[PDB]
Design a protein around this nucleic acid. Structure first.
Lengths: 93, 105, 650, 98, 81, 95, 106, 98, 86
DNA sequence: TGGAGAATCCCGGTGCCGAGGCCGCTCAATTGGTCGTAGACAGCTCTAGCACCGCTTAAACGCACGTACGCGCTGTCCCCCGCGTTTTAACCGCCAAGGGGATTACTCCCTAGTCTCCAGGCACGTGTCAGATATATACATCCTGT
DNA sequence: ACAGGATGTATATATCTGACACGTGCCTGGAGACTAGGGAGTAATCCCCTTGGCGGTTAAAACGCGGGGGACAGCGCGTACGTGCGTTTAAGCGGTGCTAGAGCTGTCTACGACCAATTGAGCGGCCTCGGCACCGGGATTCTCCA
């Protein structure tokens, strides 16, 4: 009976920018499907890169290469800054 | 016992991301910091479209962001519109795109 | 090999030796070496129930695994002992030929060496029952008389050639083993073995190989199997369709990684093949050595100069090298011998019977003569200074010592352990070694100011492109005053500051080279001025215009095909006396014995070729006063990287 | 009957349908439509009402992009009226049928 | 009374042209558009049926639909996928 | 020895199967190599996602049938599922 | 011992195919009839393209099939083109055409 | 000196180049252009001649579909002339840039 | 430090080259206002993939660029070309 | 108006050549047996949950006319566009030549699979309440005729 | 030629139903340690990639240039929005209902692991021959004259 989403993690980051505003549950599902799509897209892309360089392991360099291969330029620059924002902030903690 | 999310100081749960990486079966040997990179990127783009959605809802002056607002927030941009070009939207519609000869004489 | 007595040998391992040695011989962990604790075992079928158990709560048995492993270890041990017996018998044949020479073998089998000083017993010379022959070969040119150990070496090579085995000439690299190799091939020419021979050496080492094939043995008909794929294909149509009944050059991986060349040299069906500095032949787990053993040849020669380690894989490589019908033997169990990687829990070399086999295989197949047996005096006097190089030794104690280590730089994420690769960088370490060197390749005379004046009067010339006002300056401001002496003079458009009034006269290493010019001006000690850097080679081109005149800067490109063009114009008294090698070339063969005082203007921080590239110096009978000299400055990076720091005791 | 000019009602409806983003087609004929469509491949299949809602959504969204495309064709064709040759050209550019 | 390709009506086609932002239409648009949408949906509806068959279900969910639309490249957000 | 794998021998096989009197371009042979590469991976990337949708750990020929019934034109499928059943029956029944 | 191709009488490296199914990182386990099925349909598509290639080679009266035969093949069958609309052929060009306005003058 | 009717030589050349399959672009200026292009992102990189021939064929095959599409627009525009707005409509309806 | 530099060359696509492409594009009459603009059309096309291609090569940590790099580049938009090793 | 002729297409034979067939050779991968377990098949049950009835009703749909306005035709003109010429030039041939960079063993080693306890986030059930729908309602603004 | 009328449009009241916050099981990320094996990365080496460099020359730049479609207007016409009056059926609601996904258990078999061997093939090489240029030479052709 337990089924999965990201709607609370949608919800925090909704409240992390616009804490006042609400959102439709339809839109909640929309963002759930949206993050599912972009997650699966970038993961499939990076695993294809992993087969290309024949590297069975994967690192964050693969993910950075993946979003550079997927995103437009300002989006990709913002994304590589956002990814490199918290990697060793996680790791050295 | 500390989670990775607050350790990263972020709000996307990297552990279930790792879980659906592993059981999703894409790469052979899953790196530790790679989903930490990934969910961070996801959190950024989620908040990024959320901001323009909230801006559109503020232009409608209402609290609840609706799929109409999502269509506005994806149609006003071009690079996000580049990324979500083939994405059909539920209750989507499109922006008001009136052309020249569609005006009467 | 057997089964039952080997099983009893596994049993006496598992019932006799210590826990370190049980983990050695059986290849197990110390926990499995104990399970020593489960020792004794009445048989290996009692070890069949001795399986290391799974943990207790609060897939494979250890029996078959350890029995089979130590069984293959022991069968490899007895196969090793068969190789020990075979190499000891044929080294007894080697010493039989030595006693047939009536001559003192000054080394033994027990370290895997063979040494001789002189062929005096010169006084007794050649006995009639001997593979020794006193005279140099006639196809060897008589420009240089081959000396005592050299004639001993060519006759030892002739002996092991008659033995129809493979041999090692492992003298300490000053002895000129390529010289005696080529003299051996000239003796084969004089004994009508006139091909096919094969030489395999790196391309930078093909200097003294091909130049010695041109100089010391011109009557030896030599082919060169070197080039590109299509060039060596052309040589393959030259040699395959045998238009040339030649006598005797490719590299190791060129003859190893390309089957086409491997099958071509197999098609050639050689007689002698020589491997110089065979570190792959220092590796029985190197199949390059396997392919070099797959050359058809009744004699193989190995030319090394390092003393052999106490490594079983190294000595097994040398044994299967020197012994035919041993490389032909599969030696499959010798592979599982090698799989234990000398771990602290399982140190297979320090297994007792493997140490016994190290001493036991050691081995008269290794003609190894030290220099001190057959001695080139190594005069070590450090450089004397002018006050200008040490003036900027502190100036580049600031641009070398730019702030990079021993604080924390700002970054978006907490990345701290990835910034330890800036100091001792390549450009800054060669700039620190050029702090020791001649000091005007810095920004001290044309720093940044005089070169916009070079770009000023450069527009009125054909040497001006669409964008070269700033660009010839930006290509001239990074080059420095040594590099700006040899074109601001020569280009006749900018000559207001062309010569810097020769500040190289009052210089450190130039006046030390000028102290050693007394060996090149006043005496016939032809000097081999080594270096490291091609801009310091340009320095030694330009700084020999002051007291001893320069003839031509010796280019380091005599490696390609039998080149004499810069070495034929040599061996005069003073006007042709300063020729410029470096440590760039191979240290395998010698030139004429007239060039003796090899002088390192730029020293080498490694002890790899300073035993080798000074083989032009070490000799029993070189025809002049022979020294070697190194230019080390007293407190820069040069005295640090010089290997004279400390030692150890035992 | 006060006479309106043509297109004005169409213009305010264009503004309405660009503002309002709801469904258009009646659900019962579309449901019988997808039922008779599904009969071509296997008879007696059942469908979620949400599924046929998404069907109606995806279909409307597919045709309106073609509609804007053909509108731009007629703009290029100096016309405010459309003909099915514009649709043929649309499927030609997207490589659908023509 | 009807076959379901006539279940759509040309006032609804006209209103789709209003959301299509189209001012004037011919009398030829309607059946052409009907066939276009019909073959377009029929391309992926059979794929949804094959999904349910490989799911061994006689019922059609919505997941299969957007999976086929993803293989159609007509990707949707709003019902999970 | 510097080896790799192509499908040029199998392309030549099926070539001499259907038209023994016929040569080919090596360049067009490489086109065919890349072609069957694409043909393999397309159905592979299909069936993986199908097994994810069907919650499966394992992909059998029953998955491949529906996979090509998705990704292929219909008459190609109308020959292809027959050839697939025939080939798997020859594989399984015989030997 | 029959090869798995020859177990179905086929001309494909079904062992190597199934190995690529293993190392292809798609699923965990691989059913044994699946490489049979996919190699069979690769054989079907290969036969369908190469028969038309031989057809155009006979039309070109050529022994060695040029890539323009492949171009004409994928530009003749719809179902081939329906599969291969997104593909392009090196040194292939396009099928020839002259449009209705583009006729020469009467 | 015989002068033809204008365009007939272009029609026989359409026959010639729809007949032939070889490349069209001069390799060196195209190569220099794409080398400059890659240099703009990152300076002093290398490629293959095979790689640059692949780029040449990919570019030509990319352009000719746009050519045929715009030709169909000019057909619909009742024109044999091709205009910039035809290409703008092409990239518009395929949604590439316009 | 001595290196060369050469950009533009966008005119290296000559107008008669574009005309011959229109021949294989199969168009009879061409206005003068075309030869400038298609140079940009390929450009954004080329720059969509070329810096993407070295995005492989940077992760491939090479300095040359393979033809397979071009294959992986053109696969990203799905404009699949064959036979360059792929 | 049929001809006609330079332009153009088509064509047998010339003589390479260069890929293409074809044969060897060694190595790796496959084809074999057996475990083995766990997922998958299959059986069991059931319960939400599409179908599918019927009642009513609102509005969307359907036509009449209608006219007018938007598409079509044709006249003209013009200006831009193909089309042979020239020259010029840069590309290709092709040759050379060097070197940074691709290639492959090698060696750790650390970095990441994996097992179990838990606890703690974290999804499911359930009021809740307040936004936004839902409906009048009086005012701003713009269509359509002055 | 502003004004009359129709429609937007914030104003103001209802209600109600999605948002949400918490219980609350619950299960799973995290720890934490084993462990082992791909990755880093070293280092030394060939090689394809680059840069230059020179001659020959196809072809591009510039040009005439005449004429041909693009276009512009505009006359006509016909059909399509756009009313207003039937209409009808979609929808909304509700009640079976049955059935089929949607699970459960529960056994089992099929593929994954792991070694052998042998031969398929892969690479090198070698032979050789179909086609690919010319190459004159026969057969078409269609812009321009009878």
């Amino acid at each position: 009976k337990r089924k999965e989403s990201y709607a609370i993690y949608i919800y925090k980051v909704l409240k992390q920018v616009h804490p006042d505003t609400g959102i439709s549950s339809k839109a909640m599902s929309i963002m759930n499907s949206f993050v599912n799509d972009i997650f699966e897209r970038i993961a499939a892309e990076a695993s294809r890169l992993a087969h290309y360089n024949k590297r069975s392991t994967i690192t964050s360099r693969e993910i950075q290469t993946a979003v550079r291969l997927l995103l437009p330029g300002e989006l990709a620059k913002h994304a590589v800054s956002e990814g490199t924002k918290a990697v060793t902030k996680y790791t050295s903690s | 016992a500390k989670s990775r999310s607050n350790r990263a100081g972020l709000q996307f749960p990297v552990g279930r991301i790792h879980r659906l990486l592993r059981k999703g079966n894409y790469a052979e040997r899953v790196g530790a910091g790679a989903p930490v990179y990934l969910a961070a990127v996801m959190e950024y783009l989620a908040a990024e479209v959320l901001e323009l959605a909230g801006n559109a809802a503020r232009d409608n002056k209402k609290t609840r962001i609706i799929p109409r607002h999502l269509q506005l927030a994806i149609r006003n941009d071009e690079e996000l519109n580049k990324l979500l070009s083939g994405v059909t939207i539920a209750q989507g519609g499109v922006l008001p795109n009136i052309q020249a000869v569609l005006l009467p004489k | 090999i057997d089964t039952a007595a080997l099983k009893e040998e596994v049993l006496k391992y598992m019932n006799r030796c210590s826990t370190q040695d049980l983990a050695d011989m059986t290849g197990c962990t110390l926990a499995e070496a104990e399970f020593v604790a489960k020792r004794p075992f009445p048989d290996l079928e009692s070890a069949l129930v001795v399986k290391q158990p799974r943990p207790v709560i609060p897939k494979t048995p250890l029996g078959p695994r350890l029995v089979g492993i130590c069984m293959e270890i022991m069968r490899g041990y007895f196969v090793v002992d068969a190789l020990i017996r075979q190499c000891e018998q044929l080294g007894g044949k080697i010493q039989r030929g030595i006693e047939a020479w009536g001559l003192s073998n000054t080394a033994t089998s027990d370290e895997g060496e063979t040494s001789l000083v002189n062929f005096d017993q010169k006084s007794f010379g050649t006995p009639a029952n001997s593979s020794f022959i006193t005279t140099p070969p006639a196809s060897f040119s008589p420009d240089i008389k081959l000396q005592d150990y050299q004639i001993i070496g060519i006759n030892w090579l002739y002996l092991l050639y008659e033995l129809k085995l493979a041999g090692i000439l492992a003298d300490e690299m000053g002895l000129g083993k390529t010289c005696q190799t080529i003299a051996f091939f000239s003796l084969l020419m004089d004994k009508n073995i006139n091909g096919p021979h094969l030489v395999i050496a790196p391309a930078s080492t093909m200097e003294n190989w091909l130049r010695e094939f041109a100089k010391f043995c011109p009557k030896l008909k030599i082919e060169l199997y070197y080039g590109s794929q299509v060039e060596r294909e052309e040589i393959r149509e030259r040699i395959n369709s045998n238009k040339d009944s030649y006598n005797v050059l490719t590299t190791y991986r060129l003859a190893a990684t390309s089957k086409a060349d491997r099958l071509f040299l197999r098609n050639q069906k050689f007689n002698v093949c020589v491997y110089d500095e065979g570190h792959y032949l220092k590796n029985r787990a190197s199949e390059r050595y396997r392919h070099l053993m797959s050359i058809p040849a009744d004699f193989r020669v190995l030319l090394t100069g390092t003393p052999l380690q106490n490594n079983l894989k190294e000595l097994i490589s040398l044994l299967a090298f020197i012994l035919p019908h041993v490389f032909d033997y599969g030696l499959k169990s010798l592979d599982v011998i090698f799989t234990m990687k000398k771990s602290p829990e399982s140190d297979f070399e320090r297994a007792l019977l493997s140490e016994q086999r190290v001493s036991r295989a050691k081995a008269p197949f290794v003609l190894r003569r030290k220099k001190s047996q057959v001695l080139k005096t190594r005069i070590i006097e450090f450089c004397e200074f002018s006050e200008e190089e040490r003036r900027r030794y502190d100036d580049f104690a600031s641009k070398q010592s730019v702030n990079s280590l021993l604080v924390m730089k700002t970054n978006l994420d907490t990345n701290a352990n990835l910034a330890k690769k800036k100091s001792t960088a390549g450009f800054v370490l060669v700039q620190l070694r050029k702090l020791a060197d001649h000091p005007m390749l810095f920004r001290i005379h044309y720093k940044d100011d005089i070169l916009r004046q070079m770009a000023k009067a450069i527009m009125n010339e054909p040497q001006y492109k669409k964008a070269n006002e700033l660009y010839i300056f930006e290509d001239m401001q990074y080059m420095s005053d040594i590099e700006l002496h040899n074109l601001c003079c020569k280009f006749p458009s900018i000559n207001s500051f062309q010569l810097k009034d020769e500040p190289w006269m009052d210089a450190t290493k130039v006046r030390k080279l000028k102290k050693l010019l007394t060996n090149a001006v006043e005496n016939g000690d032809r000097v081999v001025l080594f270096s490291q850097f091609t801009q310091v080679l340009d320095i030694l081109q330009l700084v020999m215009k002051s007291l001893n005149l320069k003839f031509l800067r010796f280019d380091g490109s005599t490696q390609v095909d039998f080149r004499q063009d810069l070495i034929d114009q040599f061996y005069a008294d003073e006007s042709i006396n300063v020729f410029l090698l470096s440590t760039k070339a191979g240290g395998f063969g010698i030139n004429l014995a007239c060039a003796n005082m090899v002088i390192l203007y730029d020293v080498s921080f490694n002890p790899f070729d300073d035993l080798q590239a000074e083989d032009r110096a070490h000799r029993v009978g070189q025809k002049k006063e022979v020294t070697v000299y190194k230019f080390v400055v007293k407190d820069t990076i040069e005295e640090h990287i010089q290997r004279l720091a400390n030692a150890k005791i035992a | 009957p006060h006479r309106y000019r043509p297109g004005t009602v169409a213009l305010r409806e264009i503004r309405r349908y660009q503002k309002s983003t709801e469904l258009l087609i009646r659900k019962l004929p579309f449901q019988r439509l997808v039922r008779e469509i599904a009969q071509d491949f296997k008879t007696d299949l059942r469908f979620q009402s949400s599924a046929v809602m998404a069907l109606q959504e995806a279909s409307e969204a597919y045709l309106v992009g073609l509609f804007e495309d053909t509108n731009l064709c007629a703009i290029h064709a100096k016309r405010v009226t459309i003909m099915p040759k514009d649709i043929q050209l649309a499927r030609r550019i997207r490589g659908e049928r023509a | 009374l009807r076959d379901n390709i006539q279940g759509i009506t040309k006032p609804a086609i006209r209103r789709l042209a209003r959301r299509g932002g189209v001012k004037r239409i011919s009398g030829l648009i309607y059946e052409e558009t009907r066939g276009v949408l019909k073959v377009f949906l029929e391309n992926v509806i059979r794929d949804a049926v094959t999904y349910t068959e490989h799911a061994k279900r006689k019922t059609v969910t919505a997941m299969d639909v957007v999976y086929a639309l993803k293989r159609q490249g007509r990707t949707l957000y709003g019902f999970g996928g």
